[PDB]
């Protein structure tokens, strides 16, 4: 299985435009991740990972993005905050695992890494597994803003500015979210 294509990738996606890769037509052995980074968190929800070698799943989705360390707790079923509500939402029925590790050596830059952004304003919360890459102005006031930012109308995206001088809470963390799906279609990912 193309686990390396997701984990050892050069650049990860911003959390607001998060990446999804469908895993199929392969055997899912995780020895790779076991021989991967010293992990910050390996949080599985609704599934024993000690049973992830006898899996027999049809489709497995590898969601990947970058956030700060403070926000890794938000990547969980039934959480709240800017990331969980505006950028990446997991369902309360989530059947998968969240793998995260400090990426400060790859994603932090000298004057801040302003290529990683996240969504700060949204009128309603995302539905689970929804993706909003819109860049349109936000209306915090009652002035109708005809595509123009300003006094009470905001641009909805904000860069992280990852710097090596930040503490681990604000340092970049790469997150891979494996969603284990069970449909009637025969097994395409096994162990």
């Amino acid at each position: 299985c193309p686990f390396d294509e997701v984990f050892n990738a050069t650049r990860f996606a911003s959390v607001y435009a998060w990446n999804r890769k469908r895993i199929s037509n392969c055997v899912a052995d995780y020895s790779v991740l076991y021989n991967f980074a010293p992990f910050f968190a390996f949080k599985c929800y609704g599934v024993s990972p000690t049973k992830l070698n006898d899996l027999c799943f049809t489709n497995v989705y590898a969601d990947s993005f970058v956030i700060r360390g403070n926000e890794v707790s938000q990547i969980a079923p039934g959480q709240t905050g800017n990331i969980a509500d505006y950028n990446y939402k997991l369902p309360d029925d989530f059947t998968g695992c969240v793998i995260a590790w400090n990426s400060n050596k790859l994603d932090s830059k000298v004057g801040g890494n302003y290529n990683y952004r996240y969504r700060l304003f949204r009128k309603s919360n995302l539905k689970p597994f929804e993706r909003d890459i819109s860049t349109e102005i936000y209306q915090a006031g009652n002035k109708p803003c005809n595509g123009v930012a300003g006094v009470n109308c905001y641009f909805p995206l904000q860069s992280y500015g990852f710097r090596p001088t930040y503490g681990v809470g604000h340092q970049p963390y790469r997150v891979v979210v494996l969603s284990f799906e069970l449909l009637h279609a025969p097994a395409t990912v096994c162990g």
Partner: single-chain antibody, 229 residues
């Protein structure tokens, strides 16, 4: 493959002006910070200036602040240094460097250097250490709480005046590609330490510690390592 090439050095009168250029090749130039490091004849390595990957962040050394201007053209894969009010103490071989293989704040890739002729507060190292072939030597580097004791972004460089320095240790303890396990590093508080074991004749060189502190990069005074045949 990956290459940096300096150019634009020459003879200029004191108080004159010169512009240096650095040509990148083999990597995504606009993803990485670029830095200028110089070596003045008889002097140790000195960090001159660092530009961020975008260009909206410039950092300078107090010894040059106000007189040089660093810039980059990401469309042309070029880094530039505008040196004005050139003094005699600016006579040096100038190098451009980035951290393409380690991290954005290190110097692992270097150019060959360009020669500029115009007509301390460094980290404290021993000036000289000697050792016999096959033995081991330890070289110490003592800085303040704002550099070596602030972060763990310490580096160790091998250097021969007249050629670019080579990164030997980064992140206190790690070796880049091609560096033998005979070189190893450690840190305790404000002091870092490089140990060279199994000394060979070619290990004789100058050794500099280095520290990145956010707003600046600072080199040690350098330790000449003589390997007595």
């Amino acid at each position: 493959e990956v290459r940096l090439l300096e150019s634009g050095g020459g003879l200029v009168q004191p108080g004159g002006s010169l512009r240096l250029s650095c040509a990148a090749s083999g990597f995504t130039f606009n993803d990485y910070a670029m830095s200028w490091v110089r070596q003045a004849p008889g002097e140790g390595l000195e960090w001159v200036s660092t530009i961020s990957y975008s260009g909206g962040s410039t950092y300078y050394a107090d010894s040059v602040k106000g007189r040089f201007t660093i810039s980059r053209d990401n469309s042309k894969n070029m880094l530039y240094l505008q040196m004005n009010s050139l003094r005699a103490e600016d006579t040096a071989l100038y190098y451009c460097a980035n951290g393409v293989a380690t991290a954005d704040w290190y110097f692992d890739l270097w150019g060959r250097g360009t020669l500029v002729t115009v007509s301390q507060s460094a980290l404290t190292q021993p000036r000289s250490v000697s050792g016999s072939p096959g033995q081991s030597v330890t070289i110490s580097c003592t800085g303040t709480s704002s550099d070596v004791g602030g972060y763990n972004y310490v580096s160790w460089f091998q250097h021969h005046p007249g050629k670019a320095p080579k990164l030997m240790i980064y992140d206190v303890t790690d070796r880049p590609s091609g560096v033998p396990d005979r070189f190893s590093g450690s840190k305790s508080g404000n002091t870092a330490s490089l140990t060279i074991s199994g000394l060979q004749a070619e290990d004789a060189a100058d050794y500099y510690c280095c520290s990145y502190a956010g707003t600046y990069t600072v080199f040690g005074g350098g330790t000449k390592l003589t390997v007595l045949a």
